[PDB]
Amino acid sequence: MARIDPTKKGRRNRFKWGPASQQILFQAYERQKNPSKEERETLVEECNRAECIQRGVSPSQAQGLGSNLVTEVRVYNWFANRRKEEAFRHKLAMDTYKLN
């Protein structure tokens, strides 16, 4: 009984970002720090491109990644990590370790 059922989302295991993908995330940070539109929408594409290459998946089906599909909510998540990585510690101010 009880069962494991999805909460919402967070750090899914099957999902990875990826090496090139880290570069992608950083080179979003290069441009824009308040994720407005094109930026992010771009970012998902940019990323999907970089991810599909790791699998030799067709560009016109880069989302075929499937298992590790960089959907919007993932990118939304990472920026919403970064600003929370502030917000937590920004409120506590005694919690440099144990995840700011």
Curated annotation (Swiss-Prot):
In chain numbering, where does the motif Nuclear localization signal fall?
8-16
PTM: Ubiquitinated in s SPOP-dependent manner; leading to prteasomal degradation.
Q: Which residues carry this modification: Phosphoserine?
A: S58
Its annotated compartments are:
Nucleus
**DNA-binding region as annotated in the record:** 10-90
Q: Tissue specificity, please?
A: Liver.
Region Interaction with DNA: list its residue ranges: 14-17, 74-76, 81-84
Residue stretches spanning the membrane:
none
Per UniProt, subunit arrangement is:
Binds DNA as a dimer. Heterotetramer with PCBD1; formed by a dimer of dimers. Interacts with PCBD1. Interacts with BHLHE41. Interacts with NR5A2. Interacts with SPOP; this interaction promotes ubiquitination and degradation of HNF1A.
Family affiliation:
Belongs to the HNF1 homeobox family.
- Function (record text): Transcriptional activator that regulates the tissue specific expression of multiple genes, especially in pancreatic islet cells and in liver. Binds to the inverted palindrome 5'-GTTAATNATTAAC-3'. Activates the transcription of CYP1A2, CYP2E1 and CYP3A11.
Query: Could you identify this protein by its name?
Result: Hepatocyte nuclear factor 1-alpha
Q: Which organism is it from?
A: Rattus norvegicus
Query: Span of the full-length protein shown?
Result: 195 to 286 of 628
